[PDB]
Predict the structure of neuraminidase.
Amino acid sequence: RDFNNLTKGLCTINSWHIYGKDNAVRIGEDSDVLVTRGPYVSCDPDECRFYALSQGTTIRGKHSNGTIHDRSQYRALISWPLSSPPTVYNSRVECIGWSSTSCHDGKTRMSICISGPNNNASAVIWYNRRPVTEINTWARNILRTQESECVCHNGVCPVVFTDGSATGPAETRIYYFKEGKILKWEPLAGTAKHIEECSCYGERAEITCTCRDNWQGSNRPVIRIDPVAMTHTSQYICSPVLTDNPRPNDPTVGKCNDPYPGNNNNGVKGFSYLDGVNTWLGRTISIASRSGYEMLKVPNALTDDKSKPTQGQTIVLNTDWSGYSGSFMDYWAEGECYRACFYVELIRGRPKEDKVWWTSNSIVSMCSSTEFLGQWDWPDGAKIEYFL
Amino acid sequence: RDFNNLTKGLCTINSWHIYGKDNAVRIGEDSDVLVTRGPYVSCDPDECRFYALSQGTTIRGKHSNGTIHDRSQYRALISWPLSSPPTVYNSRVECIGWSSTSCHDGKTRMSICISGPNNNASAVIWYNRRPVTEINTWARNILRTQESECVCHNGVCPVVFTDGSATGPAETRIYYFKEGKILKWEPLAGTAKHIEECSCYGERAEITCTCRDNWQGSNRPVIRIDPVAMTHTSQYICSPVLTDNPRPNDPTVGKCNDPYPGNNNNGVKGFSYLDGVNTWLGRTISIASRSGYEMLKVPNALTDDKSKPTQGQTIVLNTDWSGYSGSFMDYWAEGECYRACFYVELIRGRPKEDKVWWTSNSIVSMCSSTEFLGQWDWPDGAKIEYFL
Amino acid sequence: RDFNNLTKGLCTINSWHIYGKDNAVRIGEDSDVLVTRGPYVSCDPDECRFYALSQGTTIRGKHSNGTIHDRSQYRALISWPLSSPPTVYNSRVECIGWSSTSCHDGKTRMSICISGPNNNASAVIWYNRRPVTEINTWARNILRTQESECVCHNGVCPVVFTDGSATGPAETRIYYFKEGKILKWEPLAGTAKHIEECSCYGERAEITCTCRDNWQGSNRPVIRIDPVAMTHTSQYICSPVLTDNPRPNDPTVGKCNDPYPGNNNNGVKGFSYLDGVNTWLGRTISIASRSGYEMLKVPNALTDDKSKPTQGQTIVLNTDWSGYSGSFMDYWAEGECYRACFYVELIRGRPKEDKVWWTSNSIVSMCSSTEFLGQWDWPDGAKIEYFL
Amino acid sequence: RDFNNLTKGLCTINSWHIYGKDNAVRIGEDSDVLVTRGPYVSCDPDECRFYALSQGTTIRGKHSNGTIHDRSQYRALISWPLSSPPTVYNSRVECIGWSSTSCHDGKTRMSICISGPNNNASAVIWYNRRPVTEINTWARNILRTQESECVCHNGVCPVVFTDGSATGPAETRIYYFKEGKILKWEPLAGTAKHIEECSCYGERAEITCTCRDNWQGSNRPVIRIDPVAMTHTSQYICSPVLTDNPRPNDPTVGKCNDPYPGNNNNGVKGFSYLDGVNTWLGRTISIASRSGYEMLKVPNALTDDKSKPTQGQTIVLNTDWSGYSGSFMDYWAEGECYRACFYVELIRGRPKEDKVWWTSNSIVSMCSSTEFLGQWDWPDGAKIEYFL
Ligand SMILES: *[C@@H]1O[C@H](CO)[C@@H](O[C@@H]2O[C@H](CO)[C@@H](O[C@@H]3O[C@H](CO[C@H]4O[C@H](CO)[C@@H](O)[C@H](O)[C@@H]4O)[C@@H](O)[C@H](O[C@H]4O[C@H](CO)[C@@H](O)[C@H](O)[C@@H]4O[C@H]4O[C@H](CO)[C@@H](O)[C@H](O)[C@@H]4O[C@H]4O[C@H](CO)[C@@H](O)[C@H](O)[C@@H]4O)[C@@H]3O)[C@H](O)[C@H]2NC(C)=O)[C@H](O)[C@H]1NC(C)=O
Ligand SMILES: *[C@@H]1O[C@H](CO)[C@@H](O[C@@H]2O[C@H](CO)[C@@H](O[C@@H]3O[C@H](CO[C@H]4O[C@H](CO)[C@@H](O)[C@H](O)[C@@H]4O)[C@@H](O)[C@H](O[C@H]4O[C@H](CO)[C@@H](O)[C@H](O)[C@@H]4O[C@H]4O[C@H](CO)[C@@H](O)[C@H](O)[C@@H]4O[C@H]4O[C@H](CO)[C@@H](O)[C@H](O)[C@@H]4O)[C@@H]3O)[C@H](O)[C@H]2NC(C)=O)[C@H](O)[C@H]1NC(C)=O
Ligand SMILES: *[C@@H]1O[C@H](CO)[C@@H](O[C@@H]2O[C@H](CO)[C@@H](O[C@@H]3O[C@H](CO[C@H]4O[C@H](CO)[C@@H](O)[C@H](O)[C@@H]4O)[C@@H](O)[C@H](O[C@H]4O[C@H](CO)[C@@H](O)[C@H](O)[C@@H]4O[C@H]4O[C@H](CO)[C@@H](O)[C@H](O)[C@@H]4O[C@H]4O[C@H](CO)[C@@H](O)[C@H](O)[C@@H]4O)[C@@H]3O)[C@H](O)[C@H]2NC(C)=O)[C@H](O)[C@H]1NC(C)=O
Ligand SMILES: *[C@@H]1O[C@H](CO)[C@@H](O[C@@H]2O[C@H](CO)[C@@H](O[C@@H]3O[C@H](CO[C@H]4O[C@H](CO)[C@@H](O)[C@H](O)[C@@H]4O)[C@@H](O)[C@H](O[C@H]4O[C@H](CO)[C@@H](O)[C@H](O)[C@@H]4O[C@H]4O[C@H](CO)[C@@H](O)[C@H](O)[C@@H]4O[C@H]4O[C@H](CO)[C@@H](O)[C@H](O)[C@@H]4O)[C@@H]3O)[C@H](O)[C@H]2NC(C)=O)[C@H](O)[C@H]1NC(C)=O
Ligand SMILES: *[C@@H]1O[C@H](CO)[C@@H](O[C@@H]2O[C@H](CO)[C@@H](O)[C@H](O)[C@H]2NC(C)=O)[C@H](O)[C@H]1NC(C)=O
Ligand SMILES: *[C@@H]1O[C@H](CO)[C@@H](O[C@@H]2O[C@H](CO)[C@@H](O)[C@H](O)[C@H]2NC(C)=O)[C@H](O)[C@H]1NC(C)=O
Ligand SMILES: CCC(CC)[C@H](NC(C)=O)[C@@H]1[C@H](O)[C@@H](C(=O)O)C[C@H]1NC(=N)N
Ligand SMILES: CCC(CC)[C@H](NC(C)=O)[C@@H]1[C@H](O)[C@@H](C(=O)O)C[C@H]1NC(=N)N
Ligand SMILES: CCC(CC)[C@H](NC(C)=O)[C@@H]1[C@H](O)[C@@H](C(=O)O)C[C@H]1NC(=N)N
Ligand SMILES: CCC(CC)[C@H](NC(C)=O)[C@@H]1[C@H](O)[C@@H](C(=O)O)C[C@H]1NC(=N)N
Ligand SMILES: [Ca+2]
Ligand SMILES: [Ca+2]
Ligand SMILES: [Ca+2]
Ligand SMILES: [Ca+2]
Ligand SMILES: [Ca+2]
């Protein structure tokens, strides 16, 4: 195998088709399904799999009580076959920790898991399923990373990390790994003022990451990385179609180089595909909670501060719970272009559904089509009442 | 691997021997077995597997309530090892949707799943376990397909779809795929007046499909496809041995080019092997409900409108529930001929057994023998009373 | 791969060491373990596995009620990893039926399963996991076979079948298969008067089978097969150490060419290794029930009608339940000789333990050592009281 | 594949990073997890796995009652994927017995399991998953071995066994195996007065084992083996930092060639890495019970009888239960040095938590880092109250 190179551009996105859905919470009501959160999808050259942060207990287990908590010693990055649920018996542990990223470089996979107390966390970088490099916290305040796949080009796999306050200036770093080793790292540059949980994809030797400004911005920060030069830039999506959550109502003009104000100290992981007129943004339908999910075609959203939608697709109705969302692509597919894909985490339980004592999720994921396909909505589908 | 070619003829069918049986409902009374319906069997060059449409819940799970419903967002085409039950832990998701077909072309497998609301469904064609082509609804009324395996010849795998009313004229199309891409498609031609759920097999470079006329006919429509010319014909099985269900009592003369009347707007997926004197038809024993199942040798059934049985084999007694049935063959077996095989879906639960709130099934499947073997009957075997 | 040839002799048996044990009934009290009976062990060139006739239900399942019954449509030959229990999720179905045999010829495996009603059963011979040949009942009275592995030599795998009364003269046949096809078959010859459930092994191009005379004999019938000439002989173990069950007390002189009398119309599958002074016989300790199990070294047992034990090893105490037993060897091991192995079925439930409504078993298996090792006893280990 | 040779030295240990954790007891509260004890970790050239002695029952099963007992016929050495829990469905049985060791030589794996009554136990040595050699008890008093991985060099895999009293002089032997066969064996020599459960690792063609003096010493005995010469030496860790348990408080001068007194007839399996200034010792935090676990850097601990700690890392708090601990390394990793690793058994249930009737454990394991990483504590995490 040779390292994969990002030689293709994105396929034209005219609509989104169903790719995978695990129905985990439904199935887990009567089977040994692990409690998770922070899911994602990532492909190897011969298979694509679902990934997530386990909570080290089944949903029906008594240890499901208290799983709203984010960082415990019982969490691990697990992967499992596409569209099956994350069960005790089919889940493969990639590494131990409560924050992660993972990507295949064409030869083998790199997985990164961070663990530890808030003031003393460390990342362990695994490559070819063995630990290779370790990075200690630099700001002693919840060292943390993407929560979705990283992207590689000719062996170089950039990864975005943040350490420091989630509600003020923090220390974000872009690490350039190759075979699990650090080639270089750089501090964040550009006009993004705060970075969290970047969702990335690659095309034509450029990696684009759409992140979460948890401090002040309801528009999303964007980091664009050149994996050959090992350099990057940052800005915000200019469009007035705001895609974080919670967020204020959409204005008619956005902000390119500063956080769009109105909501502080909160957000949700999200993503976008920024490709000139072939630009599609995801977002929750609700401006107040993680409810609903839609894709909007917003030509030149990255650079046009008045850009509005020209087409759309509802993924999850506003009467259904959503959650994190992120990008991934099958870089080893046939054809002349890379097909954009995304997943949506469907969060169930606390804090929105507090009759149960747990927090978990299921996954739904779609990929683009060049056809203009009919739309459906894809809820988690479980009935909370059954778990009482 | 090279694409498989249909170079052999059918083996002589003198009787049927047991091939596989999963006992899913029995086992599922106390194990994590998924609720399914619309099962089938399909072989790869190195393995044969069971397939079905999951309902995204176990049978003992509380989400089993309401599984009589046909089309939900929680369904998926799953496959699992021959004769094991479809469990949460061994079921491999092929694609997401509530109508499907799947077949191996000798190099890799094509799987097709349709999803969406009734007026806006779409098919996604997967090839080598990746999405390749998408087809939007053309008649905005439950785009749908075979519910059993497709057949390939030199890479070309024809698939029959229907979109439109299930109880009147509809728009049936024959698509010719190769490597998941559309080479051609044609509207139904010939004298079949309505087509549903075709069951197909191939021999000597011809593909024969036996379908369900849900509108007016109790005789079954037959589509014969030339996968090299990418052309087809259609008619009805001429024989007076009527094989749909429900159906009127058998007459002494059938109809070759029109629906045999007596029962409207209902039917059941079924199949036949039409090979001159080596012709065998399957059918439910009951004319009123999906009860019992038998194979009848009816020489020249396709073309002889007075043809009657010369031999038979009971598969499922009339005091046991049956359901859908369809054809498949192991195209990669040794020997000089293709051995005809079929499965029968054994439906349990609603609507016939309404003391439980679910609907599921188990599978029984047989293949032909050149011997004249003794017969047994093969019920699902589960006791409904145990699930109360 | 080339077909395996029986070029080695047996290793010297000085004692028996533990080889595998699945503890199925213990584990199955709280996990999805299938109800079985008629277990055995068989090796492939790269793995050795446990085999058995499933009853198509878990032990805790409500369908476990009535599993004392021998022949139902819900049975199948299943195999699973050595020493794991036969679970719903790890059991691989080899074929459907209620009587079986299976063996690897060095290239691939042949498995045979018989199914059907008592007066119309048929065997299906599978080879390379595909059905190849079928054999209809010849005496219309429970066509049936070994219940333990068959043995191959240069592709030829002889199999012993019986059809007819279990309590009087019956029609026993020796079939010689190669690649799942019938090369030849012969009626039983020699002085054995009734044959059931033969346990076989091979060494130096000769296959020796120790069987169960269910009609009149408490000594065991022996069939010796030449797989090159495709011919055989039969007699009884001459020794006065009687090894069927139930049986009369041991005399001082046995019978070589006729059934040793005292007990009619009953027996148990068993085995022996007959190799001059290196001869070891297995038997239940009790003369009245399937309780206890011991190995006795009885030099020249086959040909010496006064032969008595010179050494022994207790396998299962007389206060613990035993059951069927049979031979197998790893023909693909390293070294200069074939190591004799055997399994003992540990039957639990009915009819001896009738507080539960099921019948199942676990497995214990040993192989010979050239050392004189200390002995232990190996009970099933489950507490019946827990299942109440 | 060629046999692995110990050509590298240990990497510099500046801290320990999380490697694996299965959370077995937490998950097992509501899933089919086997009861175990005596766990360890061992790598093959392409995978690293968790190992342990099963008790042949699930934790929630009724057969969990009485699992404080050490030696039953229902135990087996099982292995399972790194960081998953030992479940009924994913656990692979390596051999049957209640004491074990296992190691890969670069070509295939050797596993050794001992079974039998106290006065008549025997070891069976498996190689390439087949039984090859057997060793009968030599002192008729619980023949027993390491309970953690063995180490190989150019095919030679030394293994330490003990037979005789656990509370007085016993007969310890060092066996040198190659391809499962005995090349040589030697009686213990040197100044160690009693040896139990050695934890070993290899570097630069030398194998170092840290053991448990169950008779008189609270300092640990050390055996150093030359696998080429097939010779060894023994002594005690000279340091006053005492690492057995229970144990007296630390003195200021230890003992190099005799047991450090104060506590008799008890101990716990443990380990160390003895590499000049790069020396790290593990131990329970409590001097009285198996509670807590810490790593201490004690330069020249092996040879300096006044050596004290210069650095440390807490692994398990003193308010959490610990248990056995042992060494392993991935000998097939990339790079120029071998990364030291260890596991800690987290024992739950009896005798410390007697509200439940079982005894089981979970696993936590770490490997060294050349960075100075922040520390966290890693408890088992299960709530006993949930199992009541
Ligand atoms: C069969 O399936 C097909 C294919 O899916 C179906 O066809 C699809 O139908 C969709 C629904 O109508 C349609 O999606 C919409 O597309 C609009 C763009 O098209 C229109 O404008 C362009 C440009 O002028 C024209 O060329 C075009 O012809 C159309 O006229 C989007 O604008 C739509 O999104 C907006 O509306 C929805 C509500 O429906 C919001 O949820 C969404 O966020 C957008 O509106 C908010 O945002 C904008 C931008 O700032 C604001 O201006 C606006 O006021 C809204 O703001 C409020 O709401 C947001 C969200 O809560 C909040 O943040 C904010 O603060 C405010 O409170 C929508 O995307 C598909 O394009 C169409 N596809 C095709 C191929 O045709 C077909 O219907 C199906 N058939 C049947 C029979 O069912
Ligand atoms: C051991 O096993 C062996 C092997 O299996 C057993 O032998 C098998 O025995 C079977 C049962 O007898 C037998 O199957 C029958 O074969 C008949 C054909 O053979 C006869 O006719 C030919 C032609 O003349 C002769 O050459 C031959 O020698 C025989 O005489 C079929 O005709 C049979 O099917 C009909 O009967 C059954 C009821 O038994 C129906 O279920 C079936 O649908 C057929 O009848 C309906 O349909 C016809 C056609 O239209 C009508 O004319 C008729 O009135 C019936 O219609 C009503 O019912 C249907 C169904 O509900 C409904 O739709 C309709 O409207 C009406 O209400 C049957 O297939 C096997 O061939 C034979 N095999 C061999 C190799 O011998 C042996 O018995 C076993 N031994 C023991 C001891 O058990
Ligand atoms: C550590 O482990 C080692 C290794 O396992 C242990 O050593 C083993 O000890 C075993 C038990 O003593 C021993 O097994 C016995 O071997 C006898 C043969 O040896 C003796 O005879 C020879 C020949 O003369 C001498 O060379 C030799 O030195 C000995 O003296 C067998 O004869 C024994 O079997 C008979 O006894 C047992 C009861 O213990 C029966 O269950 C068994 O069926 C045999 O007896 C029945 O059958 C014979 C034959 O027909 C009859 O003559 C007799 O009356 C019995 O018949 C009744 O019972 C049967 C069964 O229910 C019934 O069908 C019938 O109708 C009648 O009712 C036994 O096999 C091992 O060989 C020995 N191994 C070694 C290597 O030393 C050591 O003890 C262990 N240490 C500790 C401390 O525990
Ligand atoms: C972020 O994470 C980083 C990295 O982990 C954290 O930094 C780590 O902090 C650790 C805790 O302070 C520290 O570990 C200690 O290291 C000591 C060695 O360093 C000191 O001495 C050297 C040599 O002079 C100096 O160079 C150095 O600068 C330091 O001054 C060890 O000595 C420590 O172990 C002893 O203490 C602990 C209690 O904390 C005991 O559990 C342990 O067993 C040791 O003490 C017992 O044993 C000794 C030896 O015999 C006795 O002398 C002593 O009296 C104790 O004996 C009693 O207790 C034992 C155990 O129960 C019993 O058997 C006996 O009988 C007696 O009853 C300890 O290992 C790390 O090295 C340090 N790492 C780095 C890289 O800095 C940082 O804090 C974290 N940050 C935050 C904000 O949390
Ligand atoms: C990705 O690009 C690099 C070139 O920059 C390719 O690397 C060369 O691969 C060939 C085949 O192994 C070698 O002969 C060269 O030495 C490689 N290295 C470089 C840096 O030139 C790589 O093959 C490309 N990947 C694919 C899948 O084509
Ligand atoms: C078992 O014996 C037969 C010989 O009787 C061996 O068969 C020969 O195998 C070689 C290698 O494939 C061929 O060249 C010959 O044509 C084979 N056939 C015969 C009948 O001669 C077979 O190889 C032996 N098996 C092993 C494992 O050695
Ligand atoms: C405190 C910083 C947060 C991100 C801005 C926080 N990340 C971590 C590593 O704890 C996330 C946030 O609290 C949760 C959410 O917003 O859903 C998930 C939670 N993420 C994870 N548990 N992995
Ligand atoms: C409305 C058209 C019907 C076929 C003629 C219908 N097909 C679909 C895709 O819904 C089937 C029919 O209603 C059910 C049955 O007859 O058993 C199954 C049902 N099929 C599926 N749920 N896959
Ligand atoms: C009626 C003939 C019997 C053998 C002599 C009978 N065999 C079959 C195929 O039914 C066996 C016997 O009744 C049972 C036993 O003895 O344990 C098992 C039972 N064997 C199986 N169920 N496979
Ligand atoms: C009697 C000798 C003991 C070791 C010094 C004893 N070993 C065996 C083989 O029984 C261990 C000891 O009793 C237990 C413990 O200390 O935790 C485990 C127990 N070990 C195992 N059950 N494998
Ligand atoms: Ca924000
Ligand atoms: Ca359960
Ligand atoms: Ca009809
Ligand atoms: Ca008898
Ligand atoms: Ca001690």
